[PDB]
């Protein structure tokens, strides 16, 4: 008789940086994905949201983070780019939904909100749902780095600079990725039933 806490992830004051993206696990609850049917932009792969109310799952995962508007298209199966290669990867066989909404009013400020970071480069591409939170400065030359960028010493993360007067593709977007997992265990997350 417990309702699923989807509203807690959608209405959180605080979203994670994409390189250190947040995952909530959701289990043992009645779900109403009419929430996901209700300036938001949703794309479901493999299911229909109205049909989701007729399904049960073992767990549901809610991944959330903030990215740039012109990067939202990389949160899709089979995509490649800056964010999908190095920050958040969806598997090609992805069953789930991507919801993204403009967050300019909350995540921008005139002096620049620099509090969201993203990864610039990586030793290999991210596997699906892999999360790399390394922040150690990459040492390229013989000289050690000591936490600060310099010659031959590269910070792997960079801040977005979000300002409200930027164009849409450069102002901040909040995004949640709902996965629906089903495995050799009883299914706890059912629909309105």
């Amino acid at each position, epitope marked *: *008789t*417990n*309702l699923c*806490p989807f*509203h*807690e*992830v959608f*209405n*959180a*004051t*605080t979203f994670a940086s994409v390189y250190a993206w947040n995952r*909530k696990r959701i289990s043992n609850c009645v779900a109403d994905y009419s929430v996901i049917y209700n300036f938001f932009a949703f794309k479901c792969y493999g299911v229909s949201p109205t049909k989701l109310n007729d399904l049960c799952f073992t767990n549901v995962y809610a991944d959330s983070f903030v990215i740039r508007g012109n990067e939202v298209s990389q949160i899709a199966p089979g995509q490649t780019g800056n964010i999908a290669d190095y920050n958040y990867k969806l598997p090609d066989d992805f069953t789930g939904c991507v919801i993204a909404w403009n967050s300019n*009013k*909350l995540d921008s*400020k005139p002096s620049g909100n620099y509090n969201y970071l993203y990864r610039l480069f990586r030793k290999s591409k991210l596997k699906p749902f892999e999360r790399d939170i390394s922040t150690e400065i990459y040492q390229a030359g013989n000289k050690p780095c000591n936490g600060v960028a310099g010659p031959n010493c590269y910070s792997p993360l960079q801040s977005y600079g979000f300002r409200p007067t930027y164009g849409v593709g450069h102002q901040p977007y909040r995004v949640v990725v709902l996965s629906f997992e089903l495995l050799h265990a009883p299914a706890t997350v059912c629909g309105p039933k």
Partner: antibody
Amino acid sequence: QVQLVQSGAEVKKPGASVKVSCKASGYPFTSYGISWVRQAPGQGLEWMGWISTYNGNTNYAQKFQGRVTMTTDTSTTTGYMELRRLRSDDTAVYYCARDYTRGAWFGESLIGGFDNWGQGTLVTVSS
Amino acid sequence: EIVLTQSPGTLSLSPGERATLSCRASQTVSSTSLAWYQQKPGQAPRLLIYGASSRATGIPDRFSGSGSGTDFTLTISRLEPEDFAVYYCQQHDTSLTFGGGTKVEIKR
């Protein structure tokens, strides 16, 4: 619609405990935490704490740590607030309210406020 | 502690005039975590605005809120007799604190 009904006025000797109750109705109880605020006569609002109705986690104001205990009962959809070792300056009206400032499941901060309030409970601490 | 200071203490205005109530913060309060309440005498506080500018349901549209950083404003564009009350701001960016209240009374 949403409604929280609190227990009646209480007079307590200094040193005793008081336990105010808060009966919710008209919404899904385990989705919203409950938050507590007191107001001494003629004064402002003072926050006391918060509790998840989903798992019993509590977050108390430093001032009342050690003296306050907050509880929820899921079957009677009721929240309780116990304040111990009452002194005279605990005389106040005590309010409960439906919380949308911290989530019940995950205990993280939400874009909202204390949206529905109970009618209040007067607690007179006197000899 | 994020201390919230509201000013003036008392606001003396007439029915139909415009009410501009201040709430200042000793540090940055994220706009997601700022709220205004109204409390008439003998009643419980009522939620008016959450998230700096979002109106709670049922609240008349003559109430609005704005600001960011450390300065937040509540505007009653046209004062009805029901609006003469006390107003508290509240933050939960860091722990949770209240303002001291601003009283809006009828000027005569």
